[PDB]
């Protein structure tokens, strides 16, 4: 399914591909998942994470 994301918590690079750790709206932090970037439709939240990295 498609769900609303609260925040992008982290990013990792594995096998030449980018994945993000996502906090899902209305779900426990125990339900955070790593998702391939192609799954994401949250550009403003990715922009927030990269700026927090600087």
């Amino acid at each position: 399914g498609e769900y609303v994301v609260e925040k992008v918590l982290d990013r990792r690079v594995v096998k030449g591909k980018v994945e993000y750790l996502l906090k899902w709206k209305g779900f426990s932090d125990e339900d955070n998942t790593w998702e391939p970037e192609e799954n994401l439709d949250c550009p403003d939240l990715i922009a927030e994470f990269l700026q927090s990295q600087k």
Binding site: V5, T33, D41
Partner: peptide
């Protein structure tokens, strides 16, 4: 809205 698809399985 900021959404994403959650990988199933």
């Amino acid at each position: 809205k900021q959404t994403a698809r959650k990988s199933t399985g």
